[PDB]
DNA sequence: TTAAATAGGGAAGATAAGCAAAGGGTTGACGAAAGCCCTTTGTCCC
DNA sequence: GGGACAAAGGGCTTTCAGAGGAAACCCATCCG
């Protein structure tokens, strides 16, 4: 809770709205945690936590039956019948504008970080989308908990995701509690033996399924503790927030 | 059997415009002044049948009025009327039913209908309750650059006249297939100085005012539907009830609550599909059907 | 899963997916309440099959390292 | 180019009637997992 | 030249199966 960097009003087009087989819409916090990890490994700067807020979002299409994207022949098994309307294999798309906050541990200077971040953002992606435009990053300094409200308020205006936990399961909680599920981690099922077609022959491979937790959307000025709005990697392949379950 | 089509409609062949009211003198009818409406608040008692307990309470209402100034003693009501031809031409549908009806029709006499249509404007039935309280009513009609002046009384019991005939014959020719003709009508009255006029009222939901009057840019006027209703009050071809009413299918007046031409084998639709199915109609039935076809409406179902 | 999902329907007309998932006879058979004759044969079909072609592959942080 | 000082109490807000019918709402393209046959290429044997 | 295997490609294809169903939500502050 020392150094934060803010990038607000980032326009991304063509975001992959399909996060799982039952969740279509906002990417989960895992996507932003992976983006932060990619920034850390590529840039060489340790990043602690990531916070994301939704300024605008819209899934392409209508209220129901979102959309279908046309496919093309790109495999080496055809050539005779590859002339008319390849099959679908549906994949939804959406368009959104977000705002990001990154917890950074860097004290060498004050202006080099802005340049190094701007260099990475110009060639980065958000859930497969392309970044159209963004504002100039700026750095905020927090020494204690009381001034954390200022760096929190620096993110206006946007809607931040907070964690409320699961009671029984997402299906019953969504109808009763009126919240929306989200993916917070993966559970391993069984180890991959054949390492031929994998993208890496050194990293161990696993079959995993998403684990669901229920979240809520809150205005930035209405957040009690800012530590509840920051996400980071946890134990047993999970993503958790610093402040735990959000309580009013 | 040649049943009527599912969708079948006709257009309107007589087009009146919204009449306008002016205040002029009987001897200085050249310069005209408009009549405004304004608003007033009145106080009175509560007299409701069946509510005698609140007979000692007050009542405050807000209404709209309209009256002549104290230096003008003549109300001038002016409007235009347009007659168009090409009757027996269905606007929607009709390839054999309309043609059969036209063949059964057009043998009737348009002269009487044209005479009565012009008489209802010349005598002065187009102007409503504004008639009472006046000792002299003068009508000026302009058509084809030829001015005519009328002071005809006895709006009921259509009588013979000379000037009415030479416009009725012109209208009759246009009715049975021609282009269009236009009449300009002006009415002068002698109500007096400061007398009250009665512009047309309008339908309104709950609001502050209890009675508002139709106006155009603050000047009192009359609805064209009301003007056209009085012109077609020529139905004298039923068994009783003289002082005729307007020509409508199941000819009825909602004000009185009685419906003439009820289900006793004299209706528009019965005669329409009986004429095409063999037997023809009488002279009064033919004139009624033709007069009601000149009026608009949709028939089918 | 069976090739082309053909199977054979019952006299009233039902497939296995409807039969086993109607009123929880799957747990009634998996536990063994219907005997040990319909218990071994059903469990014989529960075999793994590995296939990774055209699947997403994502890196996840696991302590010191990646998976 | 002025200092202060206040700005009414009471009553009360109408009722009845009705809101139409008929006709129609498009087509074409977006499959996986095999069976057989033929051809070509390449390897091995005779 | 004949037999076997694999891969690629096309075509003869063609085998396989099958009518549910009902409706516009979440939410009010920094800054010049």
XYZ file of C-alpha atoms (C1' of nucleotides) in Angstrom:
694
model
C 0.000 0.000 0.000
C 2.797 2.410 -0.946
C 2.895 3.133 -4.697
C -0.070 2.993 -7.070
C -0.287 3.748 -10.799
C -3.576 4.712 -12.464
C -4.570 4.244 -16.113
C -8.113 5.459 -16.755
C -10.405 5.530 -19.798
C -8.853 2.655 -21.751
C -10.822 1.705 -24.874
C -10.695 -1.959 -25.925
C -12.593 -3.434 -28.878
C -13.308 -7.098 -29.537
C -13.097 -8.405 -25.967
C -13.779 -12.137 -25.655
C -16.992 -12.009 -23.621
C -17.007 -15.792 -23.018
C -15.140 -16.437 -19.768
C -16.699 -19.865 -19.100
C -19.559 -22.095 -20.235
C -22.084 -20.199 -18.071
C -20.523 -16.722 -17.687
C -20.706 -14.257 -20.591
C -19.700 -10.639 -20.067
C -16.955 -9.054 -17.993
C -13.639 -10.921 -17.849
C -12.945 -12.376 -14.395
C -10.284 -11.014 -12.058
C -8.034 -13.848 -13.263
C -7.630 -12.068 -16.613
C -6.425 -8.853 -14.972
C -4.171 -10.759 -12.563
C -2.613 -12.509 -15.564
C -2.199 -9.171 -17.338
C -0.394 -7.835 -14.270
C 1.825 -10.918 -14.100
C 2.641 -10.517 -17.802
C 3.549 -6.870 -17.208
C 5.766 -7.889 -14.283
C 7.617 -10.613 -16.202
C 8.053 -8.589 -19.410
C 8.951 -5.246 -17.796
C 10.913 -6.524 -14.792
C 8.910 -4.632 -12.160
C 7.204 -6.425 -9.276
C 3.437 -5.816 -9.247
C 1.503 -6.645 -6.077
C -2.219 -6.201 -6.769
C -4.527 -5.204 -9.618
C -7.855 -3.363 -9.488
C -10.270 -2.967 -12.395
C -13.348 -0.827 -12.858
C -15.963 -0.929 -15.602
C -16.677 2.464 -17.170
C -18.616 1.092 -20.150
C -19.478 -2.392 -21.369
C -21.787 -3.849 -24.010
C -22.110 -7.359 -25.429
C -22.639 -7.284 -29.190
C -26.185 -8.078 -30.281
C -29.510 -8.008 -28.450
C -31.009 -8.740 -25.028
C -30.839 -12.494 -25.717
C -28.939 -14.527 -28.329
C -25.877 -12.300 -28.312
C -24.087 -12.843 -31.634
C -22.229 -15.233 -33.930
C -18.909 -14.491 -35.632
C -18.318 -15.844 -39.129
C -15.561 -18.444 -39.429
C -13.105 -19.276 -42.204
C -11.297 -22.307 -43.599
C -7.838 -22.440 -42.023
C -6.987 -26.132 -41.467
C -5.110 -28.621 -43.652
C -7.813 -31.227 -44.172
C -9.973 -29.605 -46.836
C -9.784 -28.016 -50.276
C -12.691 -29.591 -52.122
C -15.625 -28.664 -49.892
C -13.839 -25.603 -48.446
C -15.877 -23.154 -50.504
C -19.140 -22.487 -48.615
C -19.795 -21.358 -45.051
C -17.518 -23.272 -42.672
C -19.146 -24.336 -39.365
C -19.686 -21.952 -36.485
C -18.123 -23.021 -33.162
C -19.625 -19.970 -31.440
C -17.456 -17.315 -29.785
C -19.109 -14.138 -28.438
C -17.512 -10.695 -28.533
C -18.123 -7.458 -26.646
C -16.852 -3.884 -26.393
C -15.892 -2.074 -23.207
C -13.983 0.786 -21.613
C -12.222 0.113 -18.305
C -9.950 1.723 -15.715
C -6.981 -0.014 -14.082
C -5.024 0.484 -10.863
C -1.707 -1.293 -10.307
C 0.148 -1.666 -7.008
C 3.838 -1.189 -7.799
C 6.957 -1.596 -5.659
C 9.484 0.719 -7.304
C 11.489 3.592 -5.838
C 14.257 4.290 -8.381
C 12.512 7.359 -9.835
C 9.071 8.852 -10.498
C 8.806 9.449 -14.261
C 10.547 6.352 -15.658
C 7.655 4.149 -14.500
C 5.170 6.122 -16.615
C 7.280 5.595 -19.747
C 7.895 1.894 -19.053
C 4.171 1.326 -18.466
C 3.185 3.261 -21.599
C 5.644 1.159 -23.613
C 3.991 -2.095 -22.460
C 0.388 -0.882 -22.815
C 0.893 0.111 -26.466
C 1.604 -3.563 -27.266
C -0.660 -5.348 -24.760
C -4.087 -7.004 -24.911
C -7.103 -7.301 -22.614
C -8.820 -10.701 -22.953
C -7.799 -10.806 -26.612
C -9.045 -7.318 -27.463
C -7.121 -4.457 -29.040
C -6.453 -1.290 -27.044
C -7.675 1.793 -28.910
C -6.679 4.662 -26.606
C -5.788 5.422 -22.999
C -4.851 8.352 -20.792
C -1.391 9.201 -19.503
C -0.571 7.156 -16.375
C 0.062 8.897 -13.071
C 1.504 7.690 -9.773
C 0.034 8.129 -6.290
C 1.869 7.609 -2.995
C 0.199 6.205 0.131
C 1.923 6.188 3.526
C -0.976 5.115 5.771
C -4.580 3.876 5.693
C -6.243 7.308 5.963
C -4.783 8.609 2.689
C -5.696 5.367 0.903
C -9.099 7.020 0.461
C -7.453 9.655 -1.753
C -5.827 7.132 -4.106
C -9.130 5.242 -4.119
C -11.033 8.417 -5.076
C -8.443 9.088 -7.802
C -10.105 6.287 -9.822
C -13.395 8.152 -10.327
C -15.573 7.451 -12.163
C -15.976 3.658 -12.430
C -17.615 0.601 -10.851
C -15.346 -1.762 -8.903
C -15.870 -5.490 -8.254
C -16.010 -6.614 -4.619
C -16.170 -10.148 -3.233
C -19.158 -11.338 -1.198
C -18.489 -15.086 -1.038
C -20.700 -18.074 -1.781
C -23.304 -19.438 0.633
C -24.455 -22.716 -0.951
C -23.834 -22.429 -4.698
C -24.034 -19.788 -7.412
C -27.338 -21.050 -8.863
C -29.345 -20.714 -5.635
C -27.508 -17.591 -4.438
C -28.092 -15.701 -7.708
C -31.869 -16.146 -7.471
C -32.047 -15.386 -3.743
C -29.207 -12.968 -2.958
C -29.390 -11.329 -6.427
C -25.661 -11.290 -7.222
C -23.596 -12.411 -10.213
C -21.066 -15.283 -10.241
C -17.417 -14.963 -11.209
C -14.402 -17.221 -11.723
C -11.740 -16.930 -9.018
C -9.538 -19.956 -9.706
C -9.124 -23.385 -11.233
C -9.255 -26.872 -9.724
C -6.903 -29.536 -11.073
C -8.374 -32.886 -12.142
C -5.618 -35.087 -13.606
C -2.088 -34.684 -14.947
C -1.213 -34.573 -18.642
C 1.022 -37.495 -19.606
C 1.746 -36.953 -23.313
C 3.697 -33.699 -23.699
C 3.802 -33.572 -27.503
C 1.167 -30.997 -28.500
C 1.611 -28.743 -25.460
C 3.058 -25.256 -25.875
C 5.816 -25.996 -23.334
C 7.708 -29.211 -22.568
C 9.136 -28.030 -19.227
C 6.100 -26.669 -17.400
C 3.915 -29.389 -15.821
C 0.473 -29.600 -17.421
C -2.912 -30.157 -15.782
C -6.607 -30.394 -16.585
C -8.544 -27.775 -14.635
C -12.122 -26.584 -14.203
C -13.223 -23.115 -13.049
C -14.383 -22.456 -9.497
C -17.216 -19.985 -9.052
C -17.687 -17.229 -6.492
C -20.305 -14.492 -6.239
C -19.324 -10.835 -6.628
C -20.904 -7.399 -6.553
C -20.463 -4.063 -8.293
C -19.964 -0.968 -6.145
C -19.284 2.708 -6.739
C -15.740 3.779 -5.896
C -16.830 6.516 -3.471
C -18.966 3.967 -1.580
C -16.144 1.509 -0.811
C -15.451 1.226 2.915
C -11.997 -0.403 2.806
C -9.834 -0.125 -0.305
C -8.081 -3.410 0.539
C -11.287 -5.243 -0.441
C -11.009 -3.951 -4.034
C -7.529 -5.346 -4.809
C -7.012 -8.878 -6.138
C -3.939 -11.106 -6.119
C -2.948 -14.735 -6.556
C -3.705 -17.009 -3.624
C -3.227 -20.582 -2.434
C -4.453 -23.751 -4.161
C -4.695 -21.980 -7.548
C -7.109 -19.223 -6.514
C -7.371 -15.439 -6.705
C -8.336 -13.618 -3.527
C -8.705 -10.069 -2.271
C -6.689 -8.488 0.532
C -9.725 -7.409 2.552
C -11.545 -10.735 2.385
C -15.329 -10.904 2.259
C -16.786 -7.431 1.795
C -19.086 -6.273 4.600
C -20.908 -2.952 4.895
C -73.747 -14.342 -53.633
C -71.001 -11.740 -54.165
C -70.308 -11.031 -50.507
C -68.596 -7.820 -49.462
C -64.782 -7.971 -49.285
C -62.965 -8.146 -45.970
C -61.449 -4.667 -46.444
C -63.353 -1.975 -48.353
C -63.355 1.776 -47.773
C -64.308 5.058 -49.430
C -62.942 8.587 -49.183
C -64.659 11.874 -48.316
C -65.997 13.935 -51.223
C -66.963 17.146 -49.362
C -64.101 19.003 -47.662
C -64.907 21.934 -45.354
C -62.330 24.077 -43.578
C -62.233 25.424 -40.034
C -64.550 28.429 -39.823
C -63.206 31.666 -38.356
C -65.090 34.278 -36.338
C -64.697 38.057 -36.649
C -66.451 41.083 -35.148
C -67.704 43.661 -37.664
C -70.490 46.232 -37.960
C -73.617 45.863 -40.072
C -72.803 48.979 -42.130
C -68.976 48.786 -41.947
C -68.398 45.108 -42.753
C -65.105 45.884 -44.550
C -62.636 45.996 -41.646
C -62.577 42.887 -39.450
C -61.366 42.217 -35.909
C -60.600 38.823 -34.400
C -62.351 37.421 -31.324
C -60.188 36.198 -28.445
C -61.214 33.712 -25.755
C -59.801 34.524 -22.325
C -60.516 32.747 -19.051
C -62.677 33.550 -16.024
C -63.456 32.120 -12.588
C -67.025 31.797 -11.307
C -68.632 30.943 -7.973
C -71.929 29.227 -7.331
C -73.810 26.503 -5.495
C -73.803 22.698 -5.710
C -77.011 21.296 -7.240
C -76.540 17.574 -7.916
C -79.492 15.189 -8.152
C -79.224 12.706 -5.281
C -76.797 14.777 -3.146
C -78.943 17.054 -0.943
C -76.677 17.052 2.135
C -74.096 19.320 0.442
C -76.697 21.851 -0.741
C -75.344 24.567 1.592
C -71.750 24.395 0.313
C -70.045 26.627 -2.233
C -68.496 25.860 -5.603
C -65.635 27.474 -7.539
C -65.145 26.769 -11.248
C -62.855 28.011 -14.020
C -64.290 28.414 -17.523
C -63.547 29.967 -20.907
C -65.804 32.574 -22.496
C -66.058 34.428 -25.801
C -68.163 37.483 -26.622
C -68.314 40.417 -29.004
C -66.864 43.811 -28.029
C -69.135 46.648 -26.957
C -68.558 48.632 -30.176
C -69.197 45.810 -32.684
C -72.644 44.336 -33.288
C -72.119 41.703 -35.995
C -70.495 38.268 -35.987
C -68.902 37.204 -39.277
C -68.232 33.481 -39.736
C -66.175 32.588 -42.797
C -65.012 29.307 -44.320
C -64.378 27.443 -47.581
C -65.977 24.265 -48.954
C -64.562 22.016 -51.685
C -66.558 19.499 -53.731
C -64.723 16.748 -55.616
C -65.987 14.108 -58.021
C -64.997 10.548 -58.935
C -67.581 8.854 -56.719
C -68.146 5.069 -56.732
C -64.351 4.620 -56.644
C -63.242 2.390 -53.779
C -60.027 3.413 -52.051
C -59.289 -0.090 -50.703
C -60.183 -3.244 -52.604
C -63.061 -3.699 -54.994
C -62.833 -5.342 -58.396
C -66.370 -6.661 -58.794
C -68.349 -5.562 -55.720
C -67.637 -1.857 -56.262
C -68.251 -2.150 -60.014
C -71.553 -3.972 -59.466
C -72.625 -1.332 -56.939
C -71.715 1.451 -59.383
C -73.689 -0.278 -62.147
C -76.724 -0.619 -59.866
C -76.231 3.021 -58.818
C -75.574 6.212 -60.911
C -79.118 5.958 -62.340
C -80.369 8.093 -59.437
C -80.908 11.860 -59.495
C -77.988 13.851 -58.087
C -79.988 17.057 -58.539
C -81.883 16.770 -55.255
C -78.758 15.920 -53.239
C -76.853 18.812 -54.819
C -79.782 21.164 -54.159
C -80.010 20.166 -50.492
C -76.239 20.363 -49.928
C -76.180 23.943 -51.232
C -79.397 24.824 -49.371
C -77.967 23.693 -46.023
C -75.174 26.244 -46.505
C -77.282 29.041 -48.009
C -80.084 28.929 -45.424
C -77.538 28.863 -42.606
C -77.689 25.510 -40.854
C -73.887 25.208 -40.842
C -73.642 27.813 -38.079
C -74.944 26.314 -34.821
C -76.577 27.825 -31.712
C -75.083 31.209 -32.670
C -78.271 31.483 -34.770
C -80.581 32.302 -31.844
C -80.818 35.900 -30.695
C -80.296 37.231 -34.235
C -82.927 39.125 -36.219
C -81.104 39.201 -39.578
C -78.704 36.630 -41.048
C -77.011 37.298 -44.396
C -75.084 34.705 -46.414
C -72.537 35.510 -49.135
C -71.394 32.693 -51.434
C -68.603 33.046 -54.000
C -67.971 30.455 -56.723
C -66.362 30.699 -60.183
C -66.077 34.496 -59.813
C -69.805 35.007 -59.218
C -71.143 36.407 -55.943
C -74.545 35.468 -54.532
C -76.380 36.902 -51.530
C -79.033 35.100 -49.482
C -81.376 36.009 -46.628
C -83.346 32.760 -46.753
C -85.278 31.649 -43.674
C -87.026 28.330 -42.889
C -83.982 26.067 -42.780
C -86.360 23.120 -42.433
C -88.742 22.026 -45.209
C -86.439 22.682 -48.161
C -88.347 24.981 -50.522
C -87.785 26.162 -54.088
C -85.389 29.009 -54.858
C -83.832 30.490 -57.987
C -80.270 31.399 -56.926
C -79.814 28.058 -55.144
C -80.662 26.137 -58.335
C -77.893 27.699 -60.457
C -75.295 26.534 -57.923
C -76.977 23.179 -57.304
C -76.780 22.341 -61.013
C -73.065 23.223 -60.997
C -72.456 20.958 -57.992
C -74.514 18.113 -59.496
C -72.363 17.966 -62.629
C -69.175 17.793 -60.566
C -70.650 15.057 -58.351
C -71.184 12.596 -61.229
C -67.615 12.709 -62.517
C -65.561 15.907 -62.976
C -62.677 17.689 -61.288
C -63.319 19.960 -58.307
C -65.324 23.064 -57.430
C -64.773 25.516 -54.579
C -67.220 27.716 -52.659
C -66.361 30.554 -50.269
C -69.036 31.093 -47.607
C -69.462 34.081 -45.289
C -72.202 34.621 -42.701
C -73.201 37.918 -41.078
C -75.388 38.169 -37.980
C -77.105 40.870 -35.919
C -76.680 39.480 -32.404
C -75.923 42.906 -30.944
C -73.246 44.729 -28.956
C -71.570 42.647 -26.263
C -73.420 39.444 -27.147
C -71.906 36.042 -26.402
C -70.632 33.728 -29.132
C -70.323 29.939 -28.959
C -67.140 28.507 -30.493
C -66.721 24.740 -30.621
C -65.702 22.920 -27.451
C -62.977 20.279 -27.333
C -62.449 16.987 -25.524
C -59.958 17.190 -22.646
C -58.932 14.981 -19.735
C -58.594 16.144 -16.122
C -57.196 19.688 -16.041
C -57.555 23.017 -14.243
C -60.302 24.334 -16.551
C -63.816 22.896 -16.601
C -64.652 24.137 -20.122
C -62.194 25.232 -22.809
C -63.045 26.410 -26.316
C -61.365 25.611 -29.621
C -59.137 28.380 -30.963
C -56.406 29.017 -33.539
C -53.598 31.287 -32.292
C -55.956 32.709 -29.672
C -58.838 33.377 -32.092
C -62.086 31.456 -31.650
C -62.846 28.954 -34.423
C -65.029 25.927 -35.156
C -64.189 22.305 -35.887
C -64.513 21.207 -39.502
C -66.283 17.993 -38.463
C -69.019 20.084 -36.834
C -69.294 22.252 -39.960
C -69.583 19.187 -42.196
C -72.124 17.483 -39.935
C -74.742 20.201 -40.490
C -74.320 20.167 -44.282
C -75.393 16.516 -44.651
C -78.567 16.777 -42.525
C -80.784 15.871 -45.474
C -82.188 12.450 -44.487
C -85.941 12.867 -45.013
C -86.425 9.368 -46.457
C -87.559 7.371 -43.409
C -91.017 6.695 -42.038
C -91.410 9.357 -39.318
C -89.436 11.983 -37.377
C -89.401 15.063 -39.590
C -86.824 17.845 -39.129
C -84.203 15.496 -40.594
C -80.902 14.237 -39.189
C -77.485 13.554 -40.708
C -76.947 10.642 -43.091
C -75.075 7.850 -41.291
C -75.221 4.032 -41.299
C -77.920 3.053 -38.814
C -78.855 6.713 -38.829
C -78.765 7.712 -35.180
C -78.181 10.704 -32.922
C -76.112 10.097 -29.795
C -77.392 13.298 -28.166
C -80.983 12.023 -27.970
C -80.054 8.365 -27.430
C -82.471 7.118 -30.102
C -81.296 5.161 -33.153
C -83.418 5.485 -36.279
C -82.985 3.004 -39.137
C -82.539 0.190 -36.616
C -82.739 -3.527 -37.349
C -86.000 -3.284 -39.302
C -84.732 -4.013 -42.836
C -83.609 -0.416 -43.528
C -79.828 -0.125 -43.027
C -76.873 0.913 -45.176
C -75.312 -2.545 -45.388
C -78.539 -4.462 -46.059
C -79.427 -2.241 -49.022
C -75.837 -2.282 -50.327
C -75.665 -6.074 -50.601
C -79.304 -6.338 -51.656
C -78.888 -3.979 -54.608
C -76.016 -5.994 -56.094
C -77.908 -9.265 -55.485
C -80.632 -8.848 -58.070
C -83.434 -6.548 -56.947
C -82.737 -2.826 -57.305
C -83.643 0.010 -54.933
C -86.272 2.752 -54.925
C -85.554 6.438 -55.559
C -85.267 7.319 -51.857
C -83.126 4.238 -51.186
C -80.871 5.089 -54.140
C -80.488 8.693 -52.964
C -79.756 7.506 -49.409
C -77.122 5.005 -50.564
C -75.468 7.527 -52.896
C -75.549 10.284 -50.264
C -74.011 7.964 -47.656
C -71.355 6.823 -50.160
C -70.425 10.469 -50.763
C -69.772 10.502 -47.030
C -66.743 8.409 -46.093
C -66.563 5.247 -44.028
C -65.250 1.697 -44.078
C -67.477 -1.303 -44.854
C -66.391 -4.908 -44.396
C -66.321 -7.858 -42.018
C -21.027 -39.879 -25.657
C -21.482 -42.459 -28.412
C -20.768 -42.059 -32.145
C -23.652 -40.267 -33.905
C -25.726 -40.605 -30.688
C -27.820 -43.327 -32.322
C -28.653 -45.840 -29.567
C -32.009 -47.605 -29.389
C -35.091 -46.082 -27.763
C -37.330 -47.901 -25.292
C -40.900 -49.046 -25.917
C -42.244 -45.808 -24.429
C -39.212 -44.068 -25.953
C -36.223 -43.114 -23.791
C -32.450 -43.048 -24.135
C -29.876 -43.597 -21.377
C -29.333 -39.877 -20.776
C -33.026 -39.461 -19.961
C -33.304 -42.765 -18.063
C -30.348 -42.265 -15.710
C -31.133 -38.561 -15.136
C -34.901 -38.833 -14.580
C -35.287 -39.574 -10.847
C -31.693 -40.192 -9.727
C -31.339 -43.865 -10.600
C -27.675 -43.133 -11.369
C -26.862 -42.836 -7.661
C -29.249 -45.748 -7.020
C -27.009 -47.864 -9.291
C -23.570 -46.361 -8.606
C -23.910 -47.087 -4.879
C -25.112 -50.612 -5.654
C -28.698 -50.660 -4.398
C -29.785 -52.579 -7.528
C -27.143 -55.293 -7.118
C -23.563 -55.957 -8.162
C -24.513 -56.988 -11.719
C -25.379 -53.491 -13.003
C -22.621 -51.912 -10.877
C -19.443 -53.304 -12.463
C -20.621 -52.838 -16.060
C -21.542 -49.172 -15.549
C -18.246 -48.482 -13.756
C -16.361 -50.106 -16.649
C -17.436 -47.220 -18.910
C -15.898 -44.550 -16.632
C -12.531 -44.335 -18.374
C -10.487 -41.223 -19.096
C -9.633 -40.042 -22.607
C -6.995 -37.358 -23.148
C -7.314 -34.851 -25.990
C -5.747 -31.379 -26.022
C -6.045 -30.392 -29.695
C -7.799 -27.026 -30.132
C -8.128 -26.233 -26.412
C -7.143 -23.096 -24.479
C -3.881 -23.226 -22.532
C -3.205 -20.628 -19.832
C -0.328 -20.013 -17.425
C -1.177 -19.801 -13.718
C 1.075 -18.799 -10.828
C 1.710 -21.652 -8.368
C 4.055 -20.413 -5.653
C 7.511 -20.192 -7.236
C 6.871 -21.229 -10.835
C 4.066 -21.587 -13.346
C 1.567 -24.262 -14.349
C -27.614 58.624 -2.097
C -30.649 56.403 5.683
C -31.248 54.116 10.002
C -36.194 50.477 11.712
C -41.025 47.799 10.797
C -44.773 44.799 9.598
C -47.129 42.063 4.733
C -54.888 38.800 7.540
C -57.818 35.613 9.359
C -62.773 32.359 7.521
C -65.588 29.247 3.685
C -65.495 25.697 -1.185
C -63.746 23.526 -5.657
C -70.212 19.465 -9.651
C -72.522 15.669 -11.983
C -73.966 12.249 -16.235
C -72.788 9.365 -21.303
C -69.305 6.901 -24.677
C -63.213 5.238 -26.615
C -64.658 1.164 -33.844
C -64.129 -2.539 -37.333
C -61.006 -5.271 -41.423
C -56.203 -7.276 -43.839
C -51.151 -9.073 -43.822
C -45.859 -10.453 -40.272
C -40.716 -14.003 -46.229
C -37.197 -16.429 -48.033
C -31.231 -18.613 -49.015
C -26.097 -20.062 -46.690
C -23.157 -21.941 -42.070
C -21.993 -31.325 -40.157
C -18.727 -34.957 -37.645
C -17.047 -39.501 -38.370
C -16.632 -42.765 -40.675
C -17.410 -47.000 -44.777
C -15.778 -47.983 -49.672
C -13.155 -47.020 -54.172
C -9.474 -44.761 -57.144
C -4.970 -42.100 -57.892
C -0.193 -40.393 -56.349
C 4.138 -40.496 -53.228
C 7.362 -43.349 -50.000
C 9.140 -47.850 -47.399
C 9.563 -53.450 -47.373
C 9.025 -58.386 -49.558
C 8.450 -61.633 -53.928
C 4.856 -56.259 -62.625
C 2.080 -58.368 -57.951
C 1.125 -58.085 -52.247
C 1.019 -55.082 -47.461
C 1.175 -50.250 -44.594
C 0.817 -45.019 -43.980
C -0.287 -40.170 -45.568
C -2.673 -36.707 -48.811
C -7.013 -35.678 -51.948
C -11.550 -36.365 -54.121
C -15.779 -38.715 -55.079
C -19.604 -43.158 -54.800
C -21.385 -40.758 -50.431
C -24.273 -41.717 -46.091
C -25.046 -42.922 -41.838
C -27.097 -40.461 -37.737
C -31.411 -38.083 -35.508
C -35.896 -34.799 -34.447
C -41.311 -29.380 -32.112
C -39.916 -26.359 -26.830
C -42.398 -21.704 -25.587
C -42.922 -17.453 -23.462
C -41.984 -10.572 -20.482
C -37.914 -3.389 -20.249
C -32.556 -3.186 -13.841
C -29.412 -0.497 -10.817
C -28.802 3.558 -8.510
C -27.067 10.675 -6.434
C -19.886 14.236 -5.575
C -14.909 17.073 -6.206
C -12.635 20.924 -7.572
C -11.122 25.260 -9.385
